[PDB]
Write an enzyme that holds these catalytic residues in place. Sequence first.
Site, mmCIF file in Angstrom:
data_model
loop_
_atom_site.group_PDB
_atom_site.id
_atom_site.type_symbol
_atom_site.label_atom_id
_atom_site.label_comp_id
_atom_site.label_asym_id
_atom_site.label_seq_id
_atom_site.Cartn_x
_atom_site.Cartn_y
_atom_site.Cartn_z
ATOM 1 C CB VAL A 1 -0.797 0.134 1.157
ATOM 2 C CG1 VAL A 1 -2.192 1.372 0.860
ATOM 3 C CG2 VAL A 1 -1.366 -1.420 1.646
ATOM 4 C CB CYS A 2 1.256 3.813 -2.187
ATOM 5 S SG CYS A 2 2.464 2.625 -3.226
ATOM 6 C CG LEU A 3 -1.088 6.630 3.534
ATOM 7 C CD1 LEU A 3 -2.345 6.917 2.419
ATOM 8 C CD2 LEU A 3 -1.700 5.849 4.724
#
Lengths: 157, 157
Positions: A92-94
Amino acid sequence: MSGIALSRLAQERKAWRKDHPFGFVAVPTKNPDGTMNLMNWECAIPGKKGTPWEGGLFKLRMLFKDDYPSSPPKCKFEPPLFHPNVYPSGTVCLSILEEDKDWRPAITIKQILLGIQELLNEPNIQAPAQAEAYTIYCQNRVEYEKRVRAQAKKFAP
Amino acid sequence: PADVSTFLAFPSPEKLLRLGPKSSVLIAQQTDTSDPEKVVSAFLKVSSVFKDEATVRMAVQDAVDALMQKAFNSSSFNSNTFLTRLLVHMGLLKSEDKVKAIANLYGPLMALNHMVQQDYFPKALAPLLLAFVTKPNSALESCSFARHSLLQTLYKV
């Protein structure tokens, strides 16, 4: 030489156990000898009610590096999820999960899981991690939402 | 005369032509099409020498067709992985691994313009390519002519 990471993680576990958002799960995995592996956590994020993700419970693994908290943990959905900001690998990208961007010591596991939950229905279309979900989201929003609902039902507890 | 390895090592229009009248077959023959990453590499090196000139345009187009026909016609070849890694190497999509995006997108875009019109091209990849070629990007904005051309072609797929 992960003593500093382990000290911090031990406290984050106690804090999480004391109080965390309902429906969420975040527990350290176990080593073969039965002891806790604070560097590898099995988590679960509930879909936000009122959104196409509602009803689903999305499992994810949080992996901490020996230099934590100088570096953010690596968060990967297992299995990989259909979402513009989720790599095919499941990562996941954040912004708060990038050392070069918004990651800081003030970031907690609770903030991370809530941040990912928010990202579910509020994707960052400008920075997609996969071509599939991005393409559908941009070309047929109704179809995109349809796929999201099906996936939420698929991972319903 | 020349050989495929030297060409891929130091691509130039002249070296491509030096490969001979069967250069298209040689590029495909000498490329391990069982590896998507290697196919992406060969496709980009070959297209990097594209020039809007008769002999070179034909050589590049024929090479691309031989290489991609061989790769795509493989029932085991993952076309989705090819597209994703191509976008990554063209700097249009982010990746978890470190990759040095190519400098000039002119050749790649013109080669893609030709590729998508061939029968061997999986039409399912068109929407994904279209999504990332239309997506804002400095590199693409510099090669407006080739970019507009590729998009116009994608509209007809």
